Amino acid sequence: VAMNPVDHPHGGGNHQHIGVSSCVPRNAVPGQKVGLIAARRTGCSGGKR
């Protein structure tokens, strides 16, 4: 997000922000497969055993 759009899919904007969801699918192509790849879930929580 600190870059320009030419350099990264997260770059650009008048505020630093990703813009779309950062969960990308398993079949995304190289150059496109950034962020969280094929995530089952996200976020911080307890309860795991």
Binding site: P5, V6, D7, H8, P9, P30, G31, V34
Partner: protein, 50 residues
């Protein structure tokens, strides 16, 4: 766009590992005749930082 940072690392040059002055690859002893029918004795020579 241009090629992104993760795409440039696969090509090598400045992203290759810094292997100079490494002791070598660390492995178990190779299985041979004597080990399959018995046992072989070795002695610890040094303990070294890699």
């Amino acid at each position: 766009g241009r090629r992104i940072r993760v795409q440039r690392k696969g090509a090598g040059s400045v992203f290759r590992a810094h292997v100079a002055r490494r002791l070598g690859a660390a492995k178990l002893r190779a299985n041979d005749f004597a080990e399959r029918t018995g046992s072989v004795r070795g002695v610890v020579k040094a303990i070294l930082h890699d």
